[PDB]
């Protein structure tokens, strides 16, 4: 077929002609259409916009678009054929085994005595207390949200939480957010393109110094956890399930259950689960002080269904359509992963009539789905009625894809939903939130850095 249209590529730079990327892509779509081509660096890229283009690539041709672009520098992090974690794992057996293991482990920990929900519920109480200690004073909520959300992954993975002032916990979070910044920069581009340049210790010890330090701190926690593990008892957490799997797999060089993969898998869940759920909650509180009327309506629904004393539970969610709408609207408007995570074609395919060669990097423009003017009533406004009908029933349109779609769609979504509902409703249950007086109305526009964070703001949290 015909290759997707796009801007004429320069001789050597191509289409290279960061902080404003999601805006630039919205301009190219209106200019060239829902499926267009770019030559970013030395990589051939196809951008997909709208639900139809994204679905066709990820669902209809799901088998041919489930791969990731190779990332040579991950060799520095201990990556190998049977140890690719989940997130950046090439499509194949090493990815599928670990994908099925996390999906299933999350499922099992979410059933029975409901340990995940219990961990989340306790973490919310801790988060509430930490908020109450700021009573009367404006503060940035971001740090505390990070800690609460990081402890939930800590609970999932190592069966413990950490105190909010614990030294190692703090360094761990610090290294994780520094490591995120290392995802951006020209360096990793050149290094992934010309991997032989990695033999220069100057460049190799710089490209992933924070992620490598992040992993070092994790090992120390895994080493401790390995001492306390009781293999005579059912696995309490994901690391123990993994460890048990690793024992059975001793002698099998085909297994992806090994020590090198364990640290990558745990780091993946932290990386994937921290900044997303936290940033989203940070969007949520911002939108609640920018729109206090919505806040009050949520608080009314909370009193009528839950009360001012009892802790929110997940069974409440089905009886709180307005709060559910709002939380979905926080995700849709917040749009925290506008360009998602890159896929690669493992086979020539057809999308919207155009030919996509094998080995093409696909960018799924999720933002273009969440903000589609054809689908949403007022996509650039915060509008909880995007998820309500006239009767007040919660409705989830198909264009709600903040977790992407197909085989690689967020494996964390059920946990994320749980965290968003329990943290959000718990906070609004006990506190009224507002902009501090004599401070400027905070911007509803985010800052892009792969992830989109709300603009820095402070709030007041007043007990109810
Ligand atoms: C508000 C919360 C979250 C959002 C918006 C979000 C969003 C995303 C997106 C866009 C992807 C890429 C899908 C693709 O490649 O097409 C992804 C993948 C992933 N997420 Fe999430 N995520 C969230 C929370 C979490 C949590 C809590 C966990 C873990 C407990 C998690 C674990 C993962 C993993 C492991 C992947 C890689 C899946 C794979 O490649 O097979 N995420 N997420
Ligand atoms: C891309 C895969 C790996 C590289 N980074 C650390 C481990 C893995 C996760 C990712 C980063 O934490 C991260 C978290 C959540 N959403 C992301 C979305 C995009 C991204 O880079 C474009 C990095 C993201
Ligand atoms: Zn344990
Ligand atoms: Zn209805
Ligand atoms: Zn209270």
Query: How would you name the CATH homologous superfamily?
Result: Cytochrome P450
Oligomer: monomer
Apparent shape: globular
CATH architecture: Orthogonal Bundle
How many E-type strands?
Answer: 10
User: What is the first-to-last residue Cα distance?
Assistant: 62 Å
SSE sequence, one letter per element: HEEHHHHHHHHHHHHEEEEHHEEEE
| Fraction of helical residues | 40-55%
Radius of gyration: 22 Å
Q: Which cofactor or ligand species appear?
A: protoporphyrin IX containing FE, Quinine, zinc ion
CATH hierarchy class name: Mainly Alpha
Write up this protein:
- The chain is built from 15 helices and ten strands.
- With 464 residues, it is an alpha+beta fold.
- The protein has a single domain (1-464), classed as Cytochrome p450, CATH 1.10.630.
- It has a four-stranded mixed β-sheet with strand order 1-2-6-3, sandwiched between helices. A two-stranded antiparallel ribbon has the order 4-5. It has a two-stranded antiparallel sheet with strand order 7-10.
- Strand 4 and strand 5 (354-356) form a beta hairpin.
- 38% of the residues are buried.
- One zinc ion binds next to loops.
- Residues 86-87, 99, 268-269, 272-273, 276-277, 280, 336-337, 340-341, 364, 402-404, 408-412, 415-416 line the site of protoporphyrin IX containing FE (HEM).
- Pathway: Cofactor metabolism; retinol metabolism; Lipid metabolism; fatty acid metabolism; Steroid metabolism; cholesterol metabolism.
- Its main location: endoplasmic reticulum.
- This is Cytochrome P450 2D6.
């Amino acid at each position: 077929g015909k290759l997707p249209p796009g801007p004429l590529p320069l001789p050597g730079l191509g289409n290279l002609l960061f902080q404003n990327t999601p805006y630039c892509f919205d301009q190219l779509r209106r200019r060239f259409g829902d499926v267009f081509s770019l030559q970013l660096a030395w990589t051939p890229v196809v951008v997909l916009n709208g639900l139809a283009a994204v679905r066709e690539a990820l669902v209809t041709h799901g088998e041919d678009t489930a791969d990731r672009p190779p990332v040579p520098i991950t060799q520095i992090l201990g990556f190998g054929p049977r140890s690719q974690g989940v997130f950046l794992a090439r499509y194949g057996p090493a990815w599928r085994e670990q994908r099925r293991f996390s999906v299933s482990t999350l499922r099992n920990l979410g059933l029975g005595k409901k340990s995940l929900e219990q961990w989340v519920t306790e973490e919310a109480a801790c988060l509430c207390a930490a908020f109450a200690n700021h009573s009367g004073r404006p503060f940035r909520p971001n740090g505390l949200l990070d800690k609460a959300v990081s402890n939930v992954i800590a609970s999932l993975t190592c069966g413990r939480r950490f105190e909010y002032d614990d030294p190692r916990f703090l360094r761990l979070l610090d290294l994780a957010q520094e490591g995120l910044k290392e995802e951006s920069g020209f360096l990793r581009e050149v290094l992934n393109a010309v991997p032989v340049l990695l033999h220069i210790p100057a460049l190799a010890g710089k490209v992933l110094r924070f992620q490598k330090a992040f992993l070092t701190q994790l090992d120390e926690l895994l080493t401790e956890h390995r001492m306390t593990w009781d293999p005579a008892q059912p696995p309490r957490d994901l690391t123990e399930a993994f460890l048990a799997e690793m024992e059975k797999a001793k002698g099998n060089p085909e297994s992806s259950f090994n020590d090198e993969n364990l640290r990558i898998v745990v780091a993946d869940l932290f990386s994937a689960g921290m900044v997303t759920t936290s940033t989203t909650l940070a969007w949520g509180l911002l939108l609640m002080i920018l729109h206090p009327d919505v806040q009050r309506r949520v608080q009314q629904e909370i009193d009528d269904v839950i009360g001012q004393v009892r802790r929110p539970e997940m069974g409440d969610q089905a009886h709180m359509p307005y709060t559910t709408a709002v939380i979905h609207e926080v995700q849709r408007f917040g749009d925290i992963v506008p360009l998602g995570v890159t896929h690669m074609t493992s086979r020539d395919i057809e999308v919207q009539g155009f030919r996509i060669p094998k080995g093409t990097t696909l960018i799924t423009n999720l933002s273009s789905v969440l903000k589609d003017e054809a689908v949403w009533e007022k996509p650039f406004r915060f509008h909880p009625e995007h998820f309500l009908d006239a009767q007040g029933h919660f409705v989830k349109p198909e264009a709600f894809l903040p977790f992407s779609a197909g085989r690689r769609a967020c494996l964390g979504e059920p946990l994320a939903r749980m965290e968003l509902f329990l943290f959000f409703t718990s906070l609004l249950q006990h506190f009224s939130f507002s902009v501090p007086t004599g401070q400027p109305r905070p911007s509803h526009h985010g800052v892009f850095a792969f992830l989109v964070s709300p603009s820095p703001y402070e709030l007041c949290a007043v007990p109810r």
